[PDB]
Structure formats: C-alpha cells, structure tokens
C-alpha cells in the first residue's frame, strides 16, 4: 500500500512533504534561449521546444517528451515534478 494524494494537490504540500530531496529539473532562462544544467547546446523560444515553456506557464507535465524523460531517469514525486528556474534574462 502507498499513501494516496489529497483531493486537491497544491505546491505547498508537495514541496513540504518532499523537502530536502534533489530537484527534478534545472532550467536556465536567457534573453532569447534556455538550456538545461548538463546540456551544452541551447533552445530558442521560437523553436519546437516552446511546448515546454507553455507547460511551465500552465503547470502541466509535458507528456510529449515522456520517453525522453524516462530514458534519463528523471525523478517523479507522487507523479508530479519539481523544477528549478534560474533567471539570467533580466
């Protein structure tokens, strides 16, 4: 048996319950591109990867890259994700 989530899931509960654990992803935002921590290239806000930014704005899991995420073994917390954002844009 596993503990089941509440009727409504909110950021506070998930962050508090899993505090002290590594973040799922790290994203750096620049003037006209973004990248991941271990990524060497870059992605443009006009490229096909705009879906990730849209999901981040809407707070939804990006199902389109599910297999790519599974290949990297990204950690999931109660089916959700925790994402760290660095703002170099300003």
């Amino acid at each position: 048996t596993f503990d089941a989530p509440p009727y409504v899931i909110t950021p506070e509960y998930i962050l508090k319950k899993f505090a002290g654990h590594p973040p799922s992803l790290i994203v750096h935002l620049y003037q006209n591109h973004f990248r991941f921590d271990q990524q060497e290239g870059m992605f443009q806000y006009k490229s096909p990867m705009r879906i990730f930014i849209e999901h981040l704005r809407n707070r939804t899991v990006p199902h389109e890259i599910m297999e790519y995420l599974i290949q990297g073994g990204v950690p999931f917390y109660e089916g959700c994700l925790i994402v760290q954002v660095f703002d170099h844009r300003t």
Partner: peptide, 23 residues
Amino acid sequence: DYLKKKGFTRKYLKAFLLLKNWI
C-alpha cells in the same frame, strides 16, 4: 513497479405548508 516509478511514498412558509398538509 509503476507506482514506485511515480514516487508514491509508503423557511417558515415551508413549515406552515407542511403542517397544513399533515393536518
């Protein structure tokens, strides 16, 4: 296996009418 992979931790008018209908 799937569940582990997802990080699942282990007012008065009403009464008046009713009284009339009972009477």
